[PDB]
Amino acid sequence: MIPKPVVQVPRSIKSGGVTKWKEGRGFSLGELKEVGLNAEQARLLGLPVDTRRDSVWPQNVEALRKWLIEVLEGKATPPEPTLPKVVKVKRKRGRAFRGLTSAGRRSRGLISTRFRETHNYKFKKKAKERRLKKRHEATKGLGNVLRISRIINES
Amino acid sequence: TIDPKTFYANPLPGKPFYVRFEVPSDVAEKALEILSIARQTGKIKKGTNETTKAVERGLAKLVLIAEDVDPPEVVAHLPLLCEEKKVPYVYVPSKEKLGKAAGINVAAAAAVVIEAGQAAGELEALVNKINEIRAKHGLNAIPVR
Amino acid sequence: PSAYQYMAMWYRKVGREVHERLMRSVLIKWRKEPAIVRVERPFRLERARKLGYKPKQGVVVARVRLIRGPFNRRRPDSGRRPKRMGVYGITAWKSWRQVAEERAARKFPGLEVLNSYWVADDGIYRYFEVILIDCNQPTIQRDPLYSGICGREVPRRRLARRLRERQRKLIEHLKKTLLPKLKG
RNA sequence: GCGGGGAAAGGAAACAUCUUAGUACCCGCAGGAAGGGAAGCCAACAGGGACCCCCUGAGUAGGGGCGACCGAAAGGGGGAUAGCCCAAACCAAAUCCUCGCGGGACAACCGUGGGGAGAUGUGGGGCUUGGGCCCGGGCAACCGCCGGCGGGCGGUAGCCGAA
RNA sequence: CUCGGCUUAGUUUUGCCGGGGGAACGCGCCGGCCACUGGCCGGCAAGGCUAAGCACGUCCCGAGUCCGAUAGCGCACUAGUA
RNA sequence: UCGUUGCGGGUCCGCUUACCCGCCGCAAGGCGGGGACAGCGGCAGGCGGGCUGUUCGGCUGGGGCGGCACA
RNA sequence: GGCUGACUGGGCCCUUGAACGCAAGGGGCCCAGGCGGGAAACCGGGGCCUAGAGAACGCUCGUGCCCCCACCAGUGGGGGCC
Numbered sequence A: 001m002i003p004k005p006v007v008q009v010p011r012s013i014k015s016g017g018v019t020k021w022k023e024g025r026g027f028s029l030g031e032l033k034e035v036g037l038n039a040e041q042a043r044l045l046g047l048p049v050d051t052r053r054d055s056v057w058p059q060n061v062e063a064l065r066k067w068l069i070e071v072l073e074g075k076a077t078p079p080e081p082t083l084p085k086v087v088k089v090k091r092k093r094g095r096a097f098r099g100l101t102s103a104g105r106r107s108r109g110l111i112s113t114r115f116r117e118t119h120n121y122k123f124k125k126k127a128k129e130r131r132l133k134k135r136h137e138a139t140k141g142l143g144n145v146l147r148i149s150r151i152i153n154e155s
Numbered sequence B: 001t002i003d004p005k006t007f008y009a010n011p012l013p014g015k016p017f018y019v020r021f022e023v024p025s026d027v028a029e030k031a032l033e034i035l036s037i038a039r040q041t042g043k044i045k046k047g048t049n050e051t052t053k054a055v056e057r058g059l060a061k062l063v064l065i066a067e068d069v070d071p072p073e074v075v076a077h078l079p080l081l082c083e084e085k086k087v088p089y090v091y092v093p094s095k096e097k098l099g100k101a102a103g104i105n106v107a108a109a110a111a112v113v114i115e116a117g118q119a120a121g122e123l124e125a126l127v128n129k130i131n132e133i134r135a136k137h138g139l140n141a142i143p144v145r
Numbered sequence C: 001p002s003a004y005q006y007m008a009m010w011y012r013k014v015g016r017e018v019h020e021r022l023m024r025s026v027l028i029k030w031r032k033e034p035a036i037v038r039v040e041r042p043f044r045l046e047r048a049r050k051l052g053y054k055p056k057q058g059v060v061v062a063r064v065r066l067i068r069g070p071f072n073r074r075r076p077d078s079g080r081r082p083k084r085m086g087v088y089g090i091t092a093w094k095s096w097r098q099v100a101e102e103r104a105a106r107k108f109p110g111l112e113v114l115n116s117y118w119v120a121d122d123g124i125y126r127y128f129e130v131i132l133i134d135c136n137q138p139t140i141q142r143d144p145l146y147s148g149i150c151g152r153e154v155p156r157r158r159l160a161r162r163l164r165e166r167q168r169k170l171i172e173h174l175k176k177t178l179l180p181k182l183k184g
Numbered sequence D: 001g002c003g004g005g006g007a008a009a010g011g012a013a014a015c016a017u018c019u020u021a022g023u024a025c026c027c028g029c030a031g032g033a034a035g036g037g038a039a040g041c042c043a044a045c046a047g048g049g050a051c052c053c054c055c056u057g058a059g060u061a062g063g064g065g066c067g068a069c070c071g072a073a074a075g076g077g078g079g080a081u082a083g084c085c086c087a088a089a090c091c092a093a094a095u096c097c098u099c100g101c102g103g104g105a106c107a108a109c110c111g112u113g114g115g116g117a118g119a120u121g122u123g124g125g126g127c128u129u130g131g132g133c134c135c136g137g138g139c140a141a142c143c144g145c146c147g148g149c150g151g152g153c154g155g156u157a158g159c160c161g162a163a
Numbered sequence E: 001c002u003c004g005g006c007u008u009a010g011u012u013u014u015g016c017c018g019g020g021g022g023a024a025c026g027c028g029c030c031g032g033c034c035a036c037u038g039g040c041c042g043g044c045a046a047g048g049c050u051a052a053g054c055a056c057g058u059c060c061c062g063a064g065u066c067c068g069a070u071a072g073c074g075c076a077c078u079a080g081u082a
Numbered sequence F: 001u002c003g004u005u006g007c008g009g010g011u012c013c014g015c016u017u018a019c020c021c022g023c024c025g026c027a028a029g030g031c032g033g034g035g036a037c038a039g040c041g042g043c044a045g046g047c048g049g050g051c052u053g054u055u056c057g058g059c060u061g062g063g064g065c066g067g068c069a070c071a
Numbered sequence G: 001g002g003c004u005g006a007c008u009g010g011g012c013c014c015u016u017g018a019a020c021g022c023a024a025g026g027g028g029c030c031c032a033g034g035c036g037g038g039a040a041a042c043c044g045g046g047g048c049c050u051a052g053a054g055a056a057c058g059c060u061c062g063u064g065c066c067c068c069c070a071c072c073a074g075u076g077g078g079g080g081c082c
């Protein structure tokens, strides 16, 4: 059973000091260094590696040491390496016409802000919600119906 | 450090803006001969990227610049750089001939003699004659390195 | 500093006045050529190389001239609420650079637009140069950057087999050089 | 599915800002999916760690004749998981393509000859665990091209099947 | 940066387009909900690609508290037919 | 008004090469005139039913005029 | 003749609005602070009584050793409660 990295949930000001743990994206380079591995070797063993993460958690180090011993003694089988296994690049047609060049990417807002905050993304996201009547788009004017009803029922 | 708006203030008629003084055909042909001789007996470099690095690094002795560079701004920095580093330079009329003298199969917009094995004597005479042309045109002298 | 760093000086403050003198003559010719013209070499070589240009067979550099200003917004000819009746100041969400790339692509059917950059402005026109590549040319197809546009296929049997071998050899090596340290 | 152009009716118990709606529709351009994607990020001194999609945060913050109405994001739980390249520094033609001939699983490629590209830089190198540059040590080197041969499974007709 | 405009929850603070002005360079530059200053923290824009996991139904397969010839698709039929 | 808008001389004069207008030419380019004006784009003020959207209240011995018996 | 109570902070009630929901406005009775007139009682929160009267948003002024503005501190600016 290949271990999963454990990382701390970022402690917000809103939380007031309450903290919890979560499963991380991958093991940090500091944790891998304590068990004598680099990013490439760890990825060849099937481990998820996160070179962005700076923290080193002893519980992650301990889980890595236990599982590596099992692997190096023939008791555990490493999964497939966490490196690309296919290369699939399609021929592109009409990049300029679909706004995929750098000029198109700029006008779409993708240079200055995240994809989720671009205006075309907002247009498509809300169109889907209204088409499926999902979440808040099942009721138009939901906020005002709630607001007036709260006043009447909490007076 | 040289300010281009005064250096290139008064261009010559019928020449690109980066050409500062007129070189007679005899002087240009001599430079091409020296570059060819230096290629077999000494050390040369060719192409704008290698010529610019040689001038910056202080290893240049003579810089050859072609006058028919189609977008002129490819080589226009070289005369400014040579004046700053006090490296003598001369203009040659054709980049196709400059490339052939450099011993390649394509044109060269610029070339530089690093060391003149057997051409050192002729190189000194060429630099003096270039210096007279610069004085005629009003530019200060650049001594032979 | 590469010669390309020095070539960029003509589009910086130190070289603007000399460059602006040059363009006043050059633009006279460009105003009389066809609106879209293929050129032998890019006008801003250092900028073109940063955007992916190389002088290979099948790489096309085209100069595009177009009228600047806002797009031709039409005054509506039927009923509208007042907010929808204005004309002046209303522009397109497309830049003129994208418009230039698209017009270039129409002149070279089947070619793919890689990138483009600004070259010059005058009172009425704006000039761009567009880099296009022919994805059918063998020189283009194998280029590491152009293959991202022209397509690339690596069989899964190649990568997976290579990765499996590397994993197997690593485990044997780590048995000798790492297992004692882990258990020590 | 992607880019652009782009209403009104109706609603606000009138109506113009507003909404309807970046909708209808129009123009252009792709794929079997598209688009997105590898921190000039988010956070708050505690830490997360590319992206898309689903559940939530939440009709909360916020916008608004602060009216009608509009409306996130971070964070949390999941599906799934993957990371790389071009340019440049440094080297400087060591490079690519095409054709003929010989070899080479009908290939890649090797040898040789001709043609084209290429110093306005082909190619090598390099990609945050920054790199280039100098010195030393070590192979479990690293990276890439071809898809021949053997084997297995599946799809495109069917066959057998109690009393 | 500034002016006009479309847009956005983005509000003295969203993205962009157009007109005019317009940097610096790692001893630098950018962000931390008005601007500036100091501290601290986080990063390196303006070049390119990227499987999987997500949309759809001409088509194929399966299912059904669905309809049963004025119903159910406009069409159970020499129906997009006369 | 900002830009296009450049070059000489002491806000003024001149110039042409920009730009504009016409003639010739298949094109290349030539000739003449104007000329940093004009024209064109942005921004700003004025005129602007040429065109677009709308509002043109209520009570009422029917409506309208009146009145306000509308606070 | 002497004055400014046409006062500061609040509460309760009556009427507008019958029994019976429901603005603004107006009136009455008080408590506290600090005054004016008066020997004192007492009266004064405009005019002897019943008329002269205006929501939300926005702006402006007064007030407070006042509250807030996105990692922290500061300056300018902005917002908030009455």
Ligand SMILES: [Mg+2]
Pocket: A136, A137, A140, A141
């Ligand atoms: Mg909604």
Ligand SMILES: [Mg+2]
Pocket: C081
């Ligand atoms: Mg309407």
Ligand SMILES: [Mg+2]
Pocket: none
């Ligand atoms: Mg409707």
Ligand SMILES: [Mg+2]
Pocket: D011, D012
């Ligand atoms: Mg209405």
Ligand SMILES: [Mg+2]
Pocket: none
């Ligand atoms: Mg109506």
Ligand SMILES: [Mg+2]
Pocket: none
């Ligand atoms: Mg996909």
Ligand SMILES: [Mg+2]
Pocket: none
């Ligand atoms: Mg894609």
Ligand SMILES: [Mg+2]
Pocket: none
């Ligand atoms: Mg909306």
Ligand SMILES: [Mg+2]
Pocket: none
């Ligand atoms: Mg190269």
Ligand SMILES: [Mg+2]
Pocket: D161
């Ligand atoms: Mg049977």
Ligand SMILES: [Mg+2]
Pocket: E044
């Ligand atoms: Mg950068």
Ligand SMILES: [Mg+2]
Pocket: none
């Ligand atoms: Mg029927």
Ligand SMILES: [Mg+2]
Pocket: none
């Ligand atoms: Mg029947």
Ligand SMILES: [Mg+2]
Pocket: none
């Ligand atoms: Mg004018």
Ligand SMILES: [Mg+2]
Pocket: none
């Ligand atoms: Mg005008």
Ligand SMILES: [Mg+2]
Pocket: F049
């Ligand atoms: Mg009318």
